[PDB]
Swiss-Prot record, chain A:
Record keywords, A-Z: Chaperone, Disulfide bond, Immunoglobulin domain, Periplasm, Plasmid, Signal
Intracellular or extracellular location(s): Periplasm
Family matches, as InterPro entries: Ig-like_fold, PapD-like_sf, Periplasmic_pilus_chap, Pili_assmbl_chap_C_dom_sf, Pili_assmbl_chaperone_bac, Pili_assmbl_chaperone_C, Pili_assmbl_chaperone_CS, Pili_assmbl_chaperone_N
Family (UniProt): Belongs to the periplasmic pilus chaperone family.
Molecular-function GO terms, alphabetical: protein folding chaperone
Protein name listed in UniProt: Chaperone protein caf1M
Main location: periplasm
S-S bridge residues: C93-C116
PROSITE patterns: PILI_CHAPERONE (PS00635)
Natural source organism: Yersinia pestis
Chain's role: Has a stimulatory role for the envelope antigen F1 secretion. It seems to interact with the subunit polypeptide and to prevent it from digestion by a protease.
Any GO CC annotation of this UniProt entry: outer membrane-bounded periplasmic space
Single GO BP term: cell wall organization
From Swiss-Prot, chain B:
KW Signal (keyword) present: yes
Location within or outside the cell: Secreted, Capsule
Protein name (Swiss-Prot/TrEMBL): F1 capsule antigen
One GO BP annotation of this record: cell adhesion
Top-level taxon of the source organism: Bacteria
Keywords: Capsule, Plasmid, Secreted, Signal
Region described as Contains potential antigenic determinants that may stimulate T-cells: 65-115
One Gene Ontology CC term in the entry: extracellular region
Curated annotation (Swiss-Prot), chain C:
Protein name: F1 capsule-anchoring protein
Intracellular or extracellular location(s): Cell outer membrane
Coiled coil: none
Gene name, Swiss-Prot/TrEMBL: caf1A
Function statement: A probable role in capsular biogenesis. It is likely that the caf1A molecule binds F1 antigen subunits during the extracellular secretion process.
Superkingdom of the organism of origin: Bacteria
Family membership: Belongs to the fimbrial export usher family.
Transmembrane segments: none
Length: 212, 135, 131
């Protein structure tokens, strides 16, 4: 509707998660400027709390990417001591910075997308992949929340979750640990789920009764 | 599977200062369309931040060197037409966490009003980062 | 013509981000992980240091390559003693081109066929015209 002035933004990362084999020299991921104007791409890595730490290095951390063009980032481990008995989680965030553009208030707002993906540090000691242990989640209800329990050494990145046929917004379950899902509205009072596999696709559906 | 994120921004009606030097409340300042994301993307996974960092609000500042400011909120609707909202500076104004609509989701930037004092006519700006933490 | 400023760049609290190279359509000097091609034949992947140098009026990123590295890429360093700090003078090879195709992270070296090491066989011809 051309009555109103419009602006468009967009950044695409070539994959939706990175599995980083512990101590690998480095891994590559593409970034694409899907827009009609050049941007600066600024990439950074955060710990699981979305906080600055630099056990991982992204290069180049700042560069210009022309309209419709793509480039690759190299993500490279820079030491750090990691646990061997479970995966560790960081976040790679790739931000696209746009170029400069008596009574009335003129509103001029600019936006930048900061597209963030999971960076899963996986000890070579761990045998298997998460799809092999997805069925092993168990479920309980405690203090009005739905609690997932993950006995595996992998993040269980839930991509679809339903509780008595009603949708719950997904979240990962950490390894050898739990996650507590808030129960709104008419969801209170069986759990079905799919994980996101290492290639970013939704895996098979599993279903279990709640316990306790 | 790539992680594609897009945003369209569509400006709302022109804004004018009222007789009392404030702008009206609940004005449709502009409409946001978030898109590209994988179905299952959640509202708590989206965070609109700016330099002012006011939890739940985006802040616009005059460019005349006199520092007039107003705030706005960002809110939307789910499939049952219930009020929902992305995080703005780290916090949701309204509603339960929800799965975003398939394909794309609209949000509306609505006026709250001046931060303090009469607003002068002129150009007002904000620079807003839209962070999506993909599942 | 597009212009950038630092408004939306993460600045380490009073740090200052210079965007003046980006505004010319250049990139920052520094360390880049690249694929190395010699006469179109891919030869390496490695971190290579680039600096800005002016070539016939144009600023371009320019690779610091070792004599050891050229050998590894298929080049007969002994033909070019002017090649020999540990960065070779690439302009010491006549009839040659060196381009950093940034978007691909591709470092391309074009070099007279006489400059190359032979490779029997056999998608390539028995002998070549030179220069």
């Amino acid at each position: 509707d051309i009555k109103f002035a419009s602006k468009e933004y967009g950044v695409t990362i070539g994959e939706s998660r990175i599995i980083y084999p512990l101590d690998a020299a480095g891994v590559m991921v593409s970034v694409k400027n899907t827009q009609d104007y050049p941007v600066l791409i600024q990439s950074r890595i955060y710990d699981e709390n979305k906080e600055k730490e630099d056990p991982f290095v992204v290069t180049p951390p700042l560069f210009r990417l022309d309209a419709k063009q793509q480039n690759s980032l190299r993500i490279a481990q820079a030491g750090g001591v990691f646990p061997r008995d479970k995966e560790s989680l960081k976040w790679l965030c790739v931000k696209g910075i746009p170029p400069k553009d008596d009574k009335d208030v003129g509103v001029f707002v600019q936006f930048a997308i900061n597209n963030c993906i999971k960076l899963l540090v996986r000890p070579n000691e761990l045998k298997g992949t998460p799809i092999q242990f997805a069925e092993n989640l168990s479920w309980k209800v405690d203090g009005g929340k739905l609690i997932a329990e993950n006995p595996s050494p992998f993040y269980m990145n839930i991509g679809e979750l339903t509780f008595g046929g009603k949708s719950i917004p997904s979240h990962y379950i950490p390894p050898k640990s739990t996650w507590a899902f808030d129960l709104p509205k008419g969801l209170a009072g069986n759990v079905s789920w799919r994980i996101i596999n290492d290639q970013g696709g939704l895996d098979r559906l599993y279903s279990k009764n709640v316990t306790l | 599977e790539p992680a594609r994120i897009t945003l369209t921004y569509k400006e709302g009606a022109p804004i004018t200062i009222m007789d009392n030097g404030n702008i009206d409340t609940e004005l449709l300042v502009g409409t946001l369309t978030l898109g590209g994301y994988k179905t299952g993307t959640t509202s708590t996974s989206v965070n609109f931040t700016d330099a002012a960092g006011d939890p739940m609000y985006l802040t616009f500042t005059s460019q005349d060197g006199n520092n007039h400011q107003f705030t706005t909120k960002v809110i939307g609707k789910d499939s049952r037409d219930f009020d929902i909202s992305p995080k703005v500076n780290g916090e949701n104004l309204v509603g339960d966490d929800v799965v975003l609509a398939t394909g794309s989701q609209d949000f509306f930037v609505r006026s709250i009003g001046s931060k303090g004092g009469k607003l002068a006519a002129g150009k007002y700006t904000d620079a807003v980062t839209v962070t999506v933490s993909n599942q | 013509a597009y212009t950038f400023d630092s408004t939306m760049l993460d600045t380490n609290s009073g740090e200052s981000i210079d965007v003046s190279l980006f505004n010319q359509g250049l990139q920052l000097p520094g360390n880049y992980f690249v694929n190395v091609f010699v006469n179109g034949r891919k030869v390496d992947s490695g971190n290579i240091d680039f600096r800005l140098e002016k070539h016939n009026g144009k600023e371009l990123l320019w690779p610091c390559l070792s004599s050891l590295q050229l050998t590894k890429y298929g080049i007969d360093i002994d033909k070019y003693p002017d090649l020999i700090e540990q960065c070779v003078d690439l302009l010491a090879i006549p009839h040659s081109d060196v381009q950093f195709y940034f978007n691909q992270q591709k470092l391309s070296l074009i070099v007279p066929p006489q400059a190359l090491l032979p490779r029997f066989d056999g998608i390539m011809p028995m002998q070549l015209w030179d220069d």
